[PDB]
C-alpha cells in the first residue's frame, strides 16, 4: 500500500520529494526488517544512484538496514546493487562513506555473496577506508573486512588487496571495536598455511602485537588474540617465534584463569607451541606442568582435557631428562586416575601419553611402581582401537628390558585377568597388529633373565598353546605363498625354542 506511495515519490524527479521518500525509507527499514520483494528494492536501488548526498545517506541507511536479513543480502547483491555502493565508497563525502561501507558490512555476511563481493573489487575501497580518521567509517570498514575473512577464497582475495598491513597496524587501535575486529580478522586469516607463510615474510612484529593483546582489559580481545596465536602456532616458525616473544608468562597465567574460554584458548595455544621439542625446556620452566595437571580436573570441558593431556604428551615426547619434575607434578597418577572414568577422547589421549612415557628406559620402572599396569591392562579391553592399541604398546614396552620385574609378576593375574589375560586376548584376536604385539611381548618376557617370569610364561598352558596355534596358522597361510605373516612365524619359532 504505502510502498508505491513512496515509490511514486521516488520517480518524481524533484529532490525534496525524493528525500521525503528516502528519509521515510530509512526510518521504516530502521525499525522493521523482513524479506522483501524485488520491487521494493529497485526504487531504493536506483534512487540511491543519485548524487544528492542526503539522499545517499538515507538510502544507504535503508538498504543497509534491510541487509540484516539473509535473502535481502543476495537479492540486493545479485541484481547488481553493489556498484552504486562501491562508487559511493570511493566518494569524498565521509558520511555516505560511513553508510555505504555499512551496507557492505551487513552484506556479504552470506557466503556466496562474498565471492561476488570480491570479484566486484569492493575490497580495495574497503581497505583504504579502514584508514579513516572518522571512527564510524573505520568501524564499518574493519567490520566489513572481518566479515570478509570467513571463507578461504574470500581471505586470499582479501590478501591480494593487501588489507593485511592495515589490520596489523590497526591492532594497536584505541577503539575497542576496531582492534577487536582486526584481531579476529587476522586470527581468521591465520587459518590458512599460505597466509601464515605470507604473514611470516610480510609482518615482522605481528606476533609481538598479539602477545601484547594477551594482557588486554578486553576479554574478547584477550581470548581472540590467544586463538590467533594458536592458529599461527600451527606452524613450526611461529611455535618458536611466540616463545621468543615471551608469550609463556602470559599463557601460564591465562590457563589459571577463572574464565573457561580464556583457559580453552590458552591451553590450545600452549599445546600447539609445545609441539616443538626445543620449547620444552622453557615451557617446563614457566611451570606449565602443575597447572596442566590440575587442568585434567576440568571434567566439564573435554576439549580442555584433551588439550592438556596432549600438551603433557608433547612435553614428555620431546626430552627424557626433565621427567622427574613430570612425576612430581602428579601427571602420571592423575592420567591413571582419569583413564578409568573419562570420555573416549580423553581416554585415547591418555593412552597415547602412556605409550610415549613407556618408551624411555630411564622411567619404565617408575611407571611400573606408579602402578600404571592397573590402568594399562583394563585399557587394552577398550573397543576404541587407539586406546587399546596404545595401551597395549605401552604394556609391551614396559615388559621389555627392565631390571626389575616385580610389578609385572604381580600384574600377571590382576586386575582384569592381568597381563596373562592380555596376551591370551590379543593372540585370539584376528588383528595382525595385536597378534604381533602379543608374540613380541611374550618373547620380551622370555628374554628377560628373570627365572620367575620365564616359567610363568612357559608353564601357563593357555599362552604357549596360543603361540603354537599362531605358529600353525602362520605356517599354513604363508607357504601357500612360499611377510608380516613371516615375521610373526619367526617370532613364534623364536619363542618355541625355549
Amino acid at each position: 500500500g504505502p510502498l508505491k506511495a513512496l515509490t511514486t515519490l521516488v520517480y518524481s524527479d524533484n529532490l525534496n520529494l525524493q528525500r521525503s521518500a528516502a528519509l521515510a525509507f530509512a526510518e521504516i527499514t530502521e525499525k522493521y526488517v523482513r524479506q522483501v520483494s524485488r520491487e521494493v528494492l529497485e526504487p531504493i536501488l536506483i534512487l540511491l544512484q543519485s548524487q544528492d548526498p542526503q539522499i545517499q545517506v538515507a538510502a544507504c541507511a535503508a538498504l543497509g538496514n534491510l541487509a540484516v536479513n539473509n535473502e535481502n543480502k543476495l537479492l540486493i547483491v545479485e541484481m547488481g546493487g553493489l556498484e552504486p555502493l562501491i562508487n559511493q565508497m570511493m566518494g569524498d563525502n565521509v558520511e555516505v562513506q560511513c553508510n555505504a561501507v555499512g551496507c557492505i558490512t551487513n552484506l556479504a555476511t552470506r557466503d556466496d555473496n562474498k565471492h561476488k563481493i570480491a570479484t566486484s573489487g569492493a575490497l580495495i575501497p574497503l581497505t583504504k577506508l579502514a584508514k579513516s580518521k572518522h571512527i564510524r567509517v573505520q568501524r564499518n570498514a574493519t567490520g566489513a573486512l572481518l566479515n570478509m575473512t570467513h571463507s578461504e577464497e574470500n581471505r586470499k582475495e582479501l590478501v591480494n588487496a593487501g588489507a593485511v598491513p592495515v589490520l596489523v597496524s590497526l591492532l594497536s587501535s584505541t577503539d575497542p571495536d576496531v582492534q577487536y575486529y582486526c584481531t579476529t580478522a587476522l586470527s581468521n586469516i591465520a587459518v590458512d598455511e599460505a597466509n601464515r607463510k605470507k604473514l611470516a615474510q610480510t609482518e615482522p612484529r605481528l606476533v609481538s602485537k598479539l602477545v601484547s593483546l594477551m594482557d588486554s582489559p578486553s576479554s574478547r580481545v584477550k581470548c581472540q588474540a590467544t586463538l590467533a596465536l594458536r592458529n599461527l602456532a600451527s606452524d613450526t616458525s611461529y611455535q618458536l617465534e611466540i616463545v621468543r616473544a615471551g608469550g609463556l608468562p602470559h599463557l601460564v597465567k591465562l590457563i589459571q584463569s577463572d574464565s573457561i574460554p580464556l583457559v580453552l584458548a590458552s591451553v590450545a595455544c600452549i599445546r600447539n607451541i609445545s609441539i616443538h621439542p626445543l620449547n620444552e625446556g622453557l615451557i617446563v620452566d614457566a611451570g606449565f606442568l602443575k597447572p596442566l595437571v590440575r587442568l585434567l580436573d576440568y571434567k566439564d570441558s573435554e576439549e580442555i582435557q584433551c588439550h592438556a593431556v596432549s600438551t603433557l604428551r608433547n612435553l614428555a615426547a620431546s626430552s627424557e631428562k626433565n621427567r622427574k619434575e613430570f612425576f612430581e607434578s602428579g601427571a602420571v597418577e592423575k592420567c591413571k586416575e582419569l583413564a578409568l572414568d573419562s570420555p573416549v577422547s580423553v581416554q585415547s589421549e591418555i593412552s597415547a601419553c602412556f605409550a610415549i612415557l613407556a618408551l624411555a628406559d630411564v622411567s619404565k620402572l617408575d611407571l611400573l611402581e606408579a602402578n600404571i599396569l592397573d590402568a594399562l591392562i583394563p585399557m587394552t579391553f577398550s573397543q576404541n582401537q587407539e586406546v587399546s592399541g596404545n595401551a597395549a604398546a605401552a604394556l609391551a614396552n614396559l615388559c621389555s628390558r627392565v631390571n626389575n620385574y616385580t610389578k609385572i609378576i604381580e600384574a600377571w593375574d590382576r586386575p582384569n585377568e592381568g597381563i596373562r589375560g592380555f596376551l591370551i586376548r590379543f593372540l585370539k584376536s584376528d588383528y595382525a597388529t595385536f597378534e604381533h604385539i602379543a608374540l613380541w611381548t611374550i618373547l620380551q618376557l622370555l628374554e628377560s633373565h628373570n627365572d620367575k617370569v620365564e616359567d610363568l610364561v612357559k608353564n601357563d598352558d593357555d599362552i604357549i598353546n596360543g603361540v603354537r596355534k599362531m605358529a600353525d596358522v602362520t605356517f599354513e597361510r604363508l607357504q601357500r605363498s612360499g611377510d608380516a605373516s613371516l615375521e610373526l612365524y619367526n617370532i613364534t619359532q623364536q619363542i618355541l625354542q625355549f
Binding site: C98, D177, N188, L227, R230, A352
Partner: peptide, 21 residues
Amino acid sequence: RQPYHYSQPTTAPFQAQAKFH
C-alpha cells in the same frame, strides 16, 4: 595410533554488523 582431537586452526564465528547515523 595417535589421536588427533581439536588440532586444526579455528575460524572465529563472530561477524561484525554495521551501525548507521
